[PDB]
Amino acid sequence: ATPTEQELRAELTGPVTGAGRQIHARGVWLAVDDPAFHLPRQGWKIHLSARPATLQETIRRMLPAVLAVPCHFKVVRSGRHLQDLNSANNHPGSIGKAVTIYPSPEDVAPLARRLAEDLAGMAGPRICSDRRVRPDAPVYYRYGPFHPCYDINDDGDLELVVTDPQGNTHPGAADDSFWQPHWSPDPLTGATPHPAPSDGPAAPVLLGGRYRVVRGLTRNGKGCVYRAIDTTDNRPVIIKEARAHVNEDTLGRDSRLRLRNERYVLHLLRDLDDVPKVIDHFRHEDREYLAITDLGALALGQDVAENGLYVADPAPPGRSLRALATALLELLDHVHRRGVLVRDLTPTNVVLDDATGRPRLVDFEISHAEDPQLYGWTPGYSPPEQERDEPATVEADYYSLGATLFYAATGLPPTWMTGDPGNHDPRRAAEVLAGRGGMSGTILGLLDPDPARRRAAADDIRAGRFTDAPPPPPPSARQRARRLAAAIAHSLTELSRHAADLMSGKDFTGGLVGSPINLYRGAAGMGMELLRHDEPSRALARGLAYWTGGFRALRNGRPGLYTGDTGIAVFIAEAGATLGDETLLKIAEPLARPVLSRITATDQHTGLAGIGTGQLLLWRLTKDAGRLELADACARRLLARDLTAELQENPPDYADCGAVSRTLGFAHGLAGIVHFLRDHHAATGETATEAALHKGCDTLLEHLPPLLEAARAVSAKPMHASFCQGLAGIGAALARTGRDLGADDHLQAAREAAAACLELAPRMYALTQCCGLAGIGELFLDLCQITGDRTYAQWADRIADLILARAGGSPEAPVFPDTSLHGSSGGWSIGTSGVVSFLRRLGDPAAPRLWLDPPAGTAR
Amino acid sequence: ATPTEQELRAELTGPVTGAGRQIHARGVWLAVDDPAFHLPRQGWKIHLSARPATLQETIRRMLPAVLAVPCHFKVVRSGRHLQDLNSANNHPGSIGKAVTIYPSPEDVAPLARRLAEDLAGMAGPRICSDRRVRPDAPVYYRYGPFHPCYDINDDGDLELVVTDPQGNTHPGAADDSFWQPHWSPDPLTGATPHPAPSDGPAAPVLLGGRYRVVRGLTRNGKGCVYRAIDTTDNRPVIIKEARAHVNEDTLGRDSRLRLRNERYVLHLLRDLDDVPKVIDHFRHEDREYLAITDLGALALGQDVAENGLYVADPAPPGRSLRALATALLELLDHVHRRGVLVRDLTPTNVVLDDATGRPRLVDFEISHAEDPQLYGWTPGYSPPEQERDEPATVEADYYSLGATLFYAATGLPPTWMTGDPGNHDPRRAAEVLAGRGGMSGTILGLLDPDPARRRAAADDIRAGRFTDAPPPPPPSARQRARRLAAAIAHSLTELSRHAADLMSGKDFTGGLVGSPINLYRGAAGMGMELLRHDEPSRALARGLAYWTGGFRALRNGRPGLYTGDTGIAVFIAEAGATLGDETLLKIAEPLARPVLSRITATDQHTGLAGIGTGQLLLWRLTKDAGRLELADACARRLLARDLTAELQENPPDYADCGAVSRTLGFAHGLAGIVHFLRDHHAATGETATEAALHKGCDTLLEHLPPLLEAARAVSAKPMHASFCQGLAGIGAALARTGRDLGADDHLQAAREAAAACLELAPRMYALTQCCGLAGIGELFLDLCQITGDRTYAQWADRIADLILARAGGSPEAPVFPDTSLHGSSGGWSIGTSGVVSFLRRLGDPAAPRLWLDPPAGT
Amino acid sequence: LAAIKWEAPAH
Amino acid sequence: AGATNLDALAAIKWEAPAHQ
Ligand SMILES: Nc1ncnc2c1ncn2[C@@H]1O[C@H](COP(=O)(O)OP(=O)(O)NP(=O)(O)O)[C@@H](O)[C@H]1O
Ligand SMILES: Nc1ncnc2c1ncn2[C@@H]1O[C@H](COP(=O)(O)OP(=O)(O)NP(=O)(O)O)[C@@H](O)[C@H]1O
Ligand SMILES: [Mg+2]
Ligand SMILES: [Mg+2]
């Protein structure tokens, strides 16, 4: 049926006035409120699952029970709304929560049972976040908040929480997992959380079903597909999962039927050796499972990550791009000849052989056999025609092959952003794929928007006549500088937009999302950068400063510099100062003044080190003796326990996803502490801090060479060069300890780190300050400032060329993507604000680096 | 006797570093923090009471136990801090809270019992707001918040609260009595019984002397004074209470010692029948009580309230200022003959008799007997010397008498602002007093700075006929306009000050915080007023607007226009519009959009009527159709009910002035509803609203005559003329209805209302828009603009002069009292911004009244 | 000053 | 519709596993 607001409204407006509970809709809900029922702030709520046609029938079936008691409740706006809400794509844990019912605690226990028996036989998804009453009915229940209350986490972000009897917040958040609280019971059946042993040995119990053992392998949504072992064979198997009524089409085709389409296509491809075999298909209760064969250990995504790029003609044996193209199109030709379209050939759906490393196709979820056609596409890799569910064509497959080869040749996907008309411009891909891989023009033709050109390129491929096309640089700065100017202009307007969206409250919509104030994500960093610009941007900065000052008032917070209050105070004070606004200075005066004996954290991101640096920035701003006093307290409390943290990682193994950062990095490791103690020694010249400075710098140099060799490996990853986590942060710290302590050793270490970063640049995923190109370029032009080499200037220019070549919306309107890749945001560390910071200093190298160098003249 | 902060700091820092805890000092507390203890957000805390003399040893016996178990605790910073704290003039709810301890629930009851025995026999101010462990020890405990969590109340104000297992807020009122949470058990008893059991009692009483208290004549300060029936004699009497160690003087002098001072002074005045006589003096535990003959009901203050003023001798029988003056002075001289200086001779200490010889004095607590005098002074009536605690003087008493008169003759006390040098300037008093009363010059002589003049004027009274002085005349007009300019300028900069204090959080401390955002008192009103001025003030308004947008995000609200979000949205939107700021408009775009399916109030202040007026303002600003739709919803919801039938059913039930407001007045009753309905009909012109308007306007004109009867009467209470509750609001609604409906009888109602107001203006207890002169003058220039008269212009200018002459501070740098006579604030309805709105419109007649009229620029 | 009268009383 | 799920069996499914 997929009904609209009107049908649901009618069926409601009936009985609703029968008990006189006036109705209204907000966001996505249509809610009715009993006047005799006072809705509490949290408790046990009832979720009814359903789907469109079952939604209309569900409304009708449920009214009898719900109006029999005093309670409040909300209903979904429409079946299109319930379709998005039942799609895995956006929120995986809020699928099936079609109707929510809030009654009084005693009333819950019976009401749930009555609703069950009266909805017995109604069908809908399973709500993973709730317990269920009976397996014949679509009735579930949870403990959670009824009003959207938020408390702040150690990250600085705002989280939905429920409150315990001692007033302590608890993320009542729906984590696709139900947890009952210790204080209240469980209205239908009393219960408790943890077993008799307390802080004693624990052994989690996980096991397979009929005759398959499992091992993870996918995040969320339609189905957690699993790697497995076949006990009656002990062969390795792969198990695809489908959850009933998830991803239900406008024709009533749900994920299970996608799985059946996949089984059917696999049967139609039964005689191909590079396609999975279907072994078994079984359902359990309400979950369908398709058991196919294991076809290699690594996808192309993972393989290009850990085994390097696919390069022109020769290069290492496995890594020949032309070999890859030929094999892929041979296989694709086989599939097409069998009357099947892949529709979704992407680096994650090609598995290379464990021995020969030859491509094999998997995931035929949306593949085409007969002409009903399944909707579905993969951002950036699927052609736009597929975004607009147009008739599948062979040339669609050719396009996605071109994109898969693009990734194999560069290690990142073709830039695609939600809502950007430029998404599929081939010149845009040209700028990133800078002639590399040998064949380039051929793969650019595979991505050409004219389908005939894709056919011609695939012809080139089958013939063996590949096209090797190159890219050109930028006119002796004049046009490069014109491009930078326009980049900054449009980014500024985009920032006005993001700032308005922040202060108007839009993104607060997300349950469990965002930090509106701090430096890392919120207004503080945004406005700090906005200050360095024209009078409109400075007006927006003053606005953001007052906004943050008020928002911070009378709510709980954290003391961090990147997560918390110290950065907020630095921003507000700095804005007051440069604007000449004494009331902003008054507002900042009481802000970042923590206990410090409570803070156990010692890193730049959230504790002591970053707090100390921020307090020194404030002192240099305000000549406030309390601020220097706090910075000195930071150094003093940081020298107490150096030894233990070095030697506390023995059971965790190497891979160093956490270890490289949490031990050495600037954000979380001792590079930032080195940076702070250097700052403090400059400010004061204390004799004790100097010793620790030498100790930490020496240990940094001690451990650096392995990291440098790691970054220069094929196996190397962006993490290695990042400012937050890897080499860029360490280099930025050492560039300054050298200078200030007159150490040649330190500056040389910085130079080597800088160069490793230079080589990792193009492979970097994000463009942002914490995780991407801007942090690198910042180290580069830092070194420029310290050691007028001007070769570092050229390096930074390369970084900027990359950043710009990875923007959307063409040059006149760049818009730079988030850590989310597909959209932009205005945050500083993870978004466009920091990118602007870098692009700004590129023309003002004398200006200090933000949050690392102190305020200065000719730099505002 | 009183330790230093360093003696305390030594005593503490010793052991505290022994358990690894760290000291940090904030406010008036020295807080020691155990790093291994995680402080929950609410629960059972323990208070220890002590005195400067005993705080040092209290810490001593305390540290063992507190440092044994994991917990957090705070100690008052020094001995002078504890003196402030045990004085009732400071925080009456925080007397005795010398040491506060936050431990783990598991450890509360034990930790409490131990400390109790470990103290024991030590003495301190009992804590009414807590329960008590043992009646020989100074240990107490209560359930309250440990961190300032603030929720919004129906007034728009913020109050501390704790949260129940269902997440519901509950004011953890520390001031009020002890409070039992229904969800947690008393750690010591082990049960959970509430005290709402026996609130039914008509009385309980049963004093130590077996005295039956019936009602209490105030509870403020160290002690509470009660009305007693008596059981032996069964003749009515007054009983004053003293609480131990509350108000400890620097010499160790207690409230009980002050009560014994009273007993002694009364003993010395036994032969006079105009003194209460001692009758009884008893105690039990550490609460003391003194019982004296009841002289009468209604004090002089109340007398000038419920009856009238005292005027020139040929006046009503009760009313003779010279009679009151001379009677007071004969009684006073009798008292002087015995020494015994009164020191607190104030309208509240003169109780009137049914006889012609009315004046009688009833409280000589801080009176003179021996040379070690007691400190204490009542603002405005006491002389400056007494604030500085100069030795007891007969001339000081003459000053206080000259102020008691002055009040009797003007109905209000002399303007006196904490921190104001001008405080006792006698010519400033001359302005408030325009020569009304017989002994005008004598009243001013008793208030002179030189005690010789006071002595001479008292002797002049005694000698026979009194000095009759004419007003200080204003010989200038243009210079008055200069004074107006000065007032506005200085109030603007003073606003800047209040705004800075607001946004930096300075005043957020307290178990109740005034709304920092809304129109009535928070930012919205401040900024709305600041918008009408020049660019420094417009800039501050922009800052306030963004600050409000930020503060408002992700916290509780209320939909109000005056208390809540609708006025907030009006302000943010208007600031965006005038400043040319589009992001302010985007910040306002989603703000005031409540469900009207809830909202059970019909009211300009917090209900459908005010929501509607505000949404019409928003609409006219933003041209947003949802805003008009919300106005329509408000009107439809109003029309669905038949309030007027219930008015015509039972009209004058529970009739007193306060009752008038809830029915007819603009703030809470029909006048504001009518204002909204007229606005809706103006916006749309639908028939249903015009019918409703006619019904309501008629229902108003029907009941106006009795209200005008009371407003012209002897009693003449101020609430009758106030804008929020009485004639200024009704008249302001009807000026506009009679304008837009071309109904001249409406205009006539407004004119007569304005007249009544103008008669009550001088006696009004405030300069502010809600409860004082500002609303009156606002009505006056309403009528000027509507009815090109200009006689209303003169009326408004008069009100302006009255506000000015009752202002604090200098002439070129004035500050205005708020609802609390010795204080200044930026609240619009209750403070300085509203005063500014009026003083501004006085110079721009054809400019709109804020919130009452729509805006128009070009 | 001096003196006070103590009678058992009620709470 | 010869592509059917096949007999329902008793499922032991409890929680998430691994991290890939
Ligand atoms: N036959 C196979 N051999 C080897 N690896 C496989 C095989 N099937 C799946 N995989 C791996 O496990 C993942 C399974 O997910 P996949 O089959 O692509 O469906 P999916 O994750 O749901 N993508 P989609 O169907 O578009 O939502 C793939 O990304 C591969 O990494
Ligand atoms: N005999 C009495 N007859 C009538 N009222 C009395 C009598 N004795 C006391 N009062 C009351 O005393 C009040 C004036 O203050 P009082 O109750 O004496 O204590 P107080 O306010 O604490 N004086 P002070 O300590 O100087 O501030 C008036 O409101 C009277 O009602
Ligand atoms: Mg896949
Ligand atoms: Mg008194």
From TrEMBL, chain B:
Single Gene Ontology BP annotation: carbohydrate metabolic process
Disulfide bonds: C724-C770
GO molecular function, one term: protein serine/threonine kinase activity
Keyword entries, A-Z: ATP-binding, Kinase, Metal-binding, Nucleotide-binding, Serine/threonine-protein kinase, Transferase, Zinc
UniProt key word Aminoacyl-tRNA synthetase: no
Domain of life: Bacteria
Positions of Zn(2+) binding: C724, C770
Transmembrane parts of this sequence: none
Residues reported to bind Mg(2+): D363
Stretches for region Disordered: 165-202
Domain Protein kinase span(s) in chain numbering: 211-467
Pfam families assigned: LANC_like, Pkinase, RamC_N
Matches recorded under NCBIfam families: lanthi_synth_IV (NF038150)
Name of the featured protein: Serine/threonine protein kinase
Organism: Thermomonospora curvata (strain ATCC 19995 / DSM 43183 / JCM 3096 / KCTC 9072 / NBRC 15933 / NCIMB 10081 / Henssen B9)
Classification of source organism: Bacteria, Bacillati, Actinomycetota, Actinomycetes, Streptosporangiales
UniProtKB/TrEMBL annotation, chain D:
Domain of life of the native organism: Bacteria
Name recorded for this polypeptide: Uncharacterized protein
Range within the parent protein: 10 to 29 of 51
